[PDB]
Amino acid sequence: SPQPLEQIKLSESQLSGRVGMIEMDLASGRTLTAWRADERFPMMSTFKVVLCGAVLARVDAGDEQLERKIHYRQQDLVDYSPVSEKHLADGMTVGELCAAAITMSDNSAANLLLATVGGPAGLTAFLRQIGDNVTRLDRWETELNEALPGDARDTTTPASMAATLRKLLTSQRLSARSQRQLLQWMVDDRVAGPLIRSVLPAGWFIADKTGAGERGARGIVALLGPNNKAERIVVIYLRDTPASMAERNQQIAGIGAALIEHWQR
Numbered sequence: 001s002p003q004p005l006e007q008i009k010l011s012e013s014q015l016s017g018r019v020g021m022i023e024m025d026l027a028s029g030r031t032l033t034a035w036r037a038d039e040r041f042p043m044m045s046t047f048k049v050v051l052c053g054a055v056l057a058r059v060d061a062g063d064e065q066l067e068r069k070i071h072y073r074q075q076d077l078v079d080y081s082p083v084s085e086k087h088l089a090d091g092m093t094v095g096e097l098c099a100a101a102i103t104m105s106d107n108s109a110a111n112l113l114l115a116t117v118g119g120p121a122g123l124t125a126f127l128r129q130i131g132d133n134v135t136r137l138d139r140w141e142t143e144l145n146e147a148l149p150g151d152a153r154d155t156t157t158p159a160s161m162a163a164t165l166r167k168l169l170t171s172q173r174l175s176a177r178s179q180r181q182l183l184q185w186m187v188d189d190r191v192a193g194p195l196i197r198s199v200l201p202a203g204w205f206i207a208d209k210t211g212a213g214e215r216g217a218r219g220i221v222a223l224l225g226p227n228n229k230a231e232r233i234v235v236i237y238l239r240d241t242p243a244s245m246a247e248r249n250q251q252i253a254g255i256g257a258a259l260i261e262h263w264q265r
């Protein structure tokens with residue numbers, strides 16, 4: 001397998017699209033590998049981790065409770081939304097909504113949560129407050145996935161997303177319990193978690209949130225490490241590629257393989 005940077009370059013050339021990547025030490029924040037780390041990519045569903053960071057902050061401040069039941073209507077369902085659709089009659093707790101948003105990529109759940117944090121503008125304000133002056137959410141579901149070429153709306157950079165995730169998980173911005181909850185939601189991802197585990201060698205920790213969008217947009221924000229420990233934050237985004245979903249997944253996996261085989265740094 002090529003060196004990580006060489007594999008990232010190869011992936012970009014094969015996808016005929018832009019790849020953005022950062023590998024960051026979780027404990028120290030040190031950048032280990034970076035490719036287009038300051039370039040903008042659509043967040044897609046990956047924004048939902050930051051969203052639930054804002055939710056947990058409100059819980060910590062006493063302005064929210066994970067137990068609080070939110071009741072909604074059929075008109076609030078924006079697409080598929082399998083969990084939200086199932087609990088239409090009885091509602092869902094704020095905690096449940098975050099679980100659905102993060103572990104099952106439920107889009108209606110994300111909108112309901114956005115309505116508790118002051119919408120996209122409220123979430124962007126939260127980001128500015130924690131020192132992220134780059135990441136921005138502008139739209140609700142489902143429009144935030146549009147991924148128009150050169151459109152800055154609903155984008156982050158690999159560097160900013162990695163830094164923000166580290167802040168939310170480790171910095172004491174959130175309480176101990178809230179930090180633990182956000183991590184557990186990522187550990188519990190049902191969309192990609194199990195699949196990734198099925199192809200990871202024994203001993204490799206994974207927690208993640210993935211995203212998909214228009215024009216080949218694809219993304220993953222993850223914690224990864226040997227000896228069953230979350231050693232590193234890895235963020236990979238793809239954009240403006242005509243490639244199949246299958247190849248896009250294969251290329252991201254290929255970058256992961258390169259990281260595993262060249263782990264010591």
Ligand SMILES: OC[C@H]1O[C@H](O[C@H]2[C@H](O)[C@@H](O)[C@H](OCCCCCCC3CCCCC3)O[C@@H]2CO)[C@H](O)[C@@H](O)[C@@H]1O
Pocket residue numbers: 001196199200201202206220221222223224234235236252253254255256257258260261
């Ligand atoms: O010497 C290291 C390892 O080399 C191989 O492991 C392979 C594995 O068989 C393959 O399935 C995977 O594909 C990579 C799949 C990664 C899954 C996605 C990872 C995500 C996580 C972080 C964000 C982006 C990538 O590569 C590794 C390394 O070559 C051997 O199979 C294994 O016995 C050995 O311990």
Ligand SMILES: *C(=O)C1=CNC(C(=O)O)=CS[C@H]1c1cc2n(n1)CSC2
Pocket residue numbers: 043044045046079080081105106107142143145210211212213214
């Ligand atoms: C997040 O990246 C996404 C959320 N979930 C789903 C789904 O529940 O069907 C599919 S992948 C992706 C996404 C892309 C688009 N939407 N959701 C709604 S419109 C385009």
